[PDB]
Structure 1
Amino acid sequence: RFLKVKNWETEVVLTDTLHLKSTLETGCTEYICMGSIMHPSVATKDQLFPLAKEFIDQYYSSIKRFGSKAHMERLEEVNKEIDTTSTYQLKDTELIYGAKHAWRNASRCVGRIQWSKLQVFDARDCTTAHGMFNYICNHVKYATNKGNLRSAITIFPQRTDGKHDFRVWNSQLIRYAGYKQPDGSTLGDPANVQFTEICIQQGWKPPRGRFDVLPLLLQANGNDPELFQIPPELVLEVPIRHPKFEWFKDLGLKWYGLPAVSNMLLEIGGLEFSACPFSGWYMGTEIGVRDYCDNSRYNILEEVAKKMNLDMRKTSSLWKDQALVEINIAVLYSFQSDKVTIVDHHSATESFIKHMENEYRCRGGCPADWVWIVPPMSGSITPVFHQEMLNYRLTPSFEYQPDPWNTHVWKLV
């Protein structure tokens, strides 16, 4: 079997054979497509054996050592551990390879051209939330690099019985608090109201501002999570101004420079790493379109359009569209002026096409989720809009997991 994907702008046709190696479902069936469902729907010894074998096999094939003496002893060694302990431990090389390939396999990520330049921090010796704090602080400092951002991931101990999970309760390492007011309005980031409330309950004293960096809520070994304040000098921020509109700086907008997802689960050869925060750098539209202009978020379209004296009476003036462009210009300009790494959505999607073509040549394909790859503004003037894409699930992979406050059973009376 082969499948072909066409670019309807360039007429280039790629041939995907890599899809023959996927295993978990997409969510779709032969008669219903579920490609726009956001979330479609511990292992025993016998479940773990073939998962481990498949991973080890692919690692040894990647380093051109399949069938070798070291390959066969590694399989036997892993087999022993799963018999002795009902689990096993990745070598350092395998962990690095696994985390890089989970990124390579993330069908929804447009920044994958960089997948092989991932800095992997092995934190599997950590035992306490204080230790997690220290690992995360070093990650942030390394990743931030005074604005010259570097991709990195820090991997905490894997799941054992599910009663001793390591978890970062934060959804990202740097996020701003949201506070609901009695009059029903929201201060700060409305997305983070729930987690802000949890922090306050755990003892956090909130400044109650618009851009309060949340504390880290860190869980080690299945214990109750603990609060820590990231040291403010490690949190790089960019005040947003516009190159033409002097009034833009008067909105008091800023954003943090380091995007760092901390609520995913990294799955490598059947092992589950429930705490694995990873970071890269921003594409402008993530802040400028979604963070600022989603109705559920900072929702600054009307304010900006107001200051542009736009006709907000009817939609066909396209005042929302016009104001959205200006905000995204401001975001890119602000980050670039402060020499904080950022990528615009045109540069990013163009790289992804180069990346995708390269992956089809060397790997036989590239799983990609069009619904997520196409940017949330200006879709069809970017090359990915015209690019057919096949979506399928390869492992190692990043996976969603339940929010920890929905599952944690609290220890302390």
Structure 2
Amino acid sequence: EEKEILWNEAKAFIAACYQELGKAAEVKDRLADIKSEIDLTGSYVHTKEELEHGAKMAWRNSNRCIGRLFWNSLNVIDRRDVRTKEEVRDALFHHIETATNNGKIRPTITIFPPEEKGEKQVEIWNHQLIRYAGYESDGERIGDPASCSLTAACEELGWRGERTDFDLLPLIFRMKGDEQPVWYELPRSLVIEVPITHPDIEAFSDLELKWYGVPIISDMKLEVGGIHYNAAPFNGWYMGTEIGARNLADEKRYDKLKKVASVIGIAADYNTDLWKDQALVELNKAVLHSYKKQGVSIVDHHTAASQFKRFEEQAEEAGRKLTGDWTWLIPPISPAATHIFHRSYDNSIVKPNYFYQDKPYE
């Protein structure tokens, strides 16, 4: 079964990819080459053109992503050549530096060797390459609760966090043939952070909030033409609501709304005062203001939805079916102010795509 799945996925991908690239005449010969390679080796190897366009297609097919207008300008870094943990580490450091680009963020993906027999060559433990640690013990909660389990796993490996609310987790990953992952501290010169201030409310800095510049998802699997790239970190720039309406606001995250209410001078006592809603808006204005002031790329949810409308229009014009997950595409503040809220989306899964995979801790 394994090989037949691979071959069937390969045929569908190569045909579609080569059609998009105006290489339709080359499909026949390429598939023959591929089928012999599968027969002889159990797998096949993407050309650089296939890998690049495959990763772009995977972004285009990501139902939960509002940012897809820009799918075709993804910067694809081919690191299928790495073999050592030093090479992986340096590749991850490089992704951070080149994606950050001094604040003018470049959407980028770095692609490591794919699974072989379902056997991973490189197993990345981080959820994002840059993320804050979380701690909970004896009533005391510090940092990002979402990171508690990974943080505890890191501390099992000899790492120790300073226990501020914003400790940077080290990179942590395992190589094929190694029993334990290795970890490496992030050089702070590589990591841009943004302090959160408000355009009109001076007291907002009293909250001492900050967030990191670049979200780099590192625990999803890129699947292209039946090949499983379990290690392929990718990043865009933030939409402000991700930080202001979720990371800093969720009760199970940094839970800052009551503190926000206090510094903006409103009571947090009555549901009918809509103090949570007002606090959310001011916190979200502050996040956008702060990123802009520092010269770090960010998009607000109105502009993002307008871009996504253009993506829908572009799909129709190209004669491609549009797929999407309405429940993720609507922004978590003022969703009915966006066109997304007022239409529906087909949530079918189309490949190439990015997929969740089981965590190696937990």
Normalising by structure 2, report the TM-score: 0.97
Q: Deviations 1:57-111 (Å, cap 9, x if unpaired)?
A: 1122112232x2x322211110011101111111110000100000000011000
Partner of 1:188: 143
For 2:94, the equivalent position in structure 1 comes to 138
Which residue, out of 196, 210, 213, partners 1:254?
210
Match of 1:305 in 2: 261
Contact 1:102/1:398 (CA < 8 Å) preserved in 2? Answer: yes
In the TM superposition, structure 1's runs of 4+ consecutive aligned residues that sit over 4 Å from their partners are none
Aligned residues of 1:44 and 1:86 also touching (Cα < 8 A): no
Query: After superposition, what is the alpha-carbon deviation per residue over 1:366-408, rounded to whole angstroms, capped at 9, x for unaligned?
Result: 11111100001111012211122222111101111000225xx
Match of 1:356 in 2: 312
Contact 2:219–2:231 (8 Å) recurs in 1:
yes
- In structure 1, list runs of 5 or more residues that go unmatched: 1-42, 407-413
Residue 222 of structure 1 deviates from its aligned partner by 5.0
- Is 1:115 the counterpart of 2:75? The answer is no
Query: Could you tell me which residue of structure 1 aligns to residue 172 of structure 2?
Result: 217
Give the Cα separation in 1 of the matches to 2:354 and 2:319.
19
Instruction: Indicate the SS of the match to 2:361.
Output: helix
Provide the secondary structure at the position in 1 that maps to 2:223.
strand
Q: CA deviation at 1:268?
A: 0.4
Partners of 1:266 and 1:96 in 2: CA distance: 12
Structure 2 counterpart of 1:385: 341
Residue 269 (structure 1) aligned with residue 232 (structure 2): no
1:287 — aligned with what? 243
Is residue 2:8 matched to residue 1:57?
A: no
Q: SS of 2:131's equivalent? A: coil
Kindly state the Cα deviation for residue 185 of structure 1 after the two structures are TM-superposed. Answer: 2.8
Identity %: 43
Shift of the 162–405 alpha-carbon distance from structure 1 to 2, 3 Å rule, reads: farther
Aligned partner of 2:155 among 179, 197, 200? 200
TM alignment of 1:5-404, pairs within 5 A: 44-66=2-24, 68=25, 70-182=26-138, 184-223=139-178, 224-404=180-360
TM-score (ref. length: structure 1): 0.85
Partners of 1:175 and 1:389 lie apart in 2 by 31
5+ residue gaps, structure 2, are: none
Aligned partner of 1:409 in structure 2 is none
CA contact (8 A) 2:150 2:361 kept: no
User: How far apart, CA to CA, are the structure 2 residues paired with 1:263 and 1:162?
Assistant: 16
C-alpha separation between the residues in 1 aligned to 2:215 and 2:269?
A: 36
Following superposition, the deviation at residue 363 of structure 1 comes to 3.0
Q: 2:232 aligns to what SS in structure 1?
A: coil
**How many residues were matched structurally?**
361
| AA aligned opposite 2:305 | T
Contact 1:127 1:221 in 2 (8 A): no
Report if aligned partners of 1:356, 1:365 keep a CA contact under 8 Å in 2: no
Instruction: Compare the two structures and name the one with the higher helix fraction.
Output: 2
Distance 2:93 2:216 in 1: 12
- Give the secondary-structure state (helix, strand or coil) at the position aligned to 1:217: strand
Whether the aligned pair in 2 keeps the contact of 1:265 and 1:272 (CA below 8 Å) is yes
Residue equivalent to 1:7: none
Equivalent pair of 1:350/1:384 in contact (CA under 8 Å): no
Contact 1:166 1:222 in 2 (8 A): no
Task: Provide the rounded CA distance (Å) in 2 between the counterparts of 1:325 and 1:173.
Answer: 28
